[PDB]
């Protein structure tokens with residue numbers, strides 16, 4: 001089945017925490033990139049993650065409060081109104097035929 | 109200066125050929141992915157290219173008439189009306205903080 005992401009919890013109190021879980025990662029991965037919003041856009045990149053070295057590198061939209069895990073999961077702490085809405089994950093395969101999934105939680 | 113792409117020629121007769129040139133490739137590249145349109149969208153991916161292995165892999169929007177070169181350049185032969193408009197290159201860096209550039213020509 002399709003690459004998918006869900007957020008835990010779906011509705012998050014301001015100041016609390018949310019984990020973006022990822023399911024059905026394909027094989028032969030090179031890396032992951034998370035973006036704020038519904039689309040892949042470098043200006044809105046949160047983080048880039050190289051699997052070979054297990055190394056996270058921040059993008060322009062990185063808040064300082066995000067952590068990516070080896071299975072692509074994204075933890076966000078001390079959430080703000082600004083964190084609310086859509087997130088997009090791009091999975092970079094080793095053949096560079098890539099996949100995206102979006103991506104939502106609601107701050108209250 | 110910024111990663112850019114220009115098309116040669118910019119206005120192309122139906123049935124002829126167009127080369128999408130790429131300038132200012134950054135260092136530390138792992139590969140390239142070309143998309144039809146203004147955005148990175150897997151459903152519209154033309155090709156994925158691994159630099160290390162020199163291996164091109166076709167995506168869903170591949171027409172059969174496209175060739176990617178080691179410097180990311182894209183040749184399109186026997187162009188159709190359907191080929192007209194924007195193309196987007198994504199450059200995949202080793203730290204996964206990637207870059208995109210668009211991308212157009214006009215068929216007449």
Ligand SMILES: CCCCCCCCO[C@@H]1O[C@H](CO)[C@@H](O)[C@H](O)[C@H]1O
Nearest residue numbers: 006007008009019021022023073075
């Ligand atoms: C700090 C706690 C994080 C531990 C990992 C939690 C992931 C548990 O697993 C997830 O549980 C969800 C329950 O809502 C299910 O909907 C998902 O299908 C399942 O993958």
Ligand SMILES: CCCCCCCCO[C@@H]1O[C@H](CO)[C@@H](O)[C@H](O)[C@H]1O
Nearest residue numbers: 019020021022023069071072073075
């Ligand atoms: C607070 C830190 C949370 C730990 C981060 C890793 C937890 C991820 O846990 C994994 O998530 C996957 C989907 O993303 C699923 O395979 C399973 O729910 C689980 O094994």
Ligand SMILES: CCCCCCCCO[C@@H]1O[C@H](CO)[C@@H](O)[C@H](O)[C@H]1O
Nearest residue numbers: 128129130131132177179180181183
């Ligand atoms: C007609 C097919 C020939 C293959 C193309 C040869 C490589 C293209 O040529 C290169 O294009 C780059 C743009 O990507 C430019 O930056 C370089 O200056 C130029 O040498």
Ligand SMILES: CCCCCCCCO[C@@H]1O[C@H](CO)[C@@H](O)[C@H](O)[C@H]1O
Nearest residue numbers: 125162174175176177178179183185
């Ligand atoms: C170092 C890069 C080598 C790439 C191999 C080129 C594969 C595309 O084969 C193409 O065949 C066409 C004939 O129909 C020619 O007009 C093109 O010049 C050629 O690129």
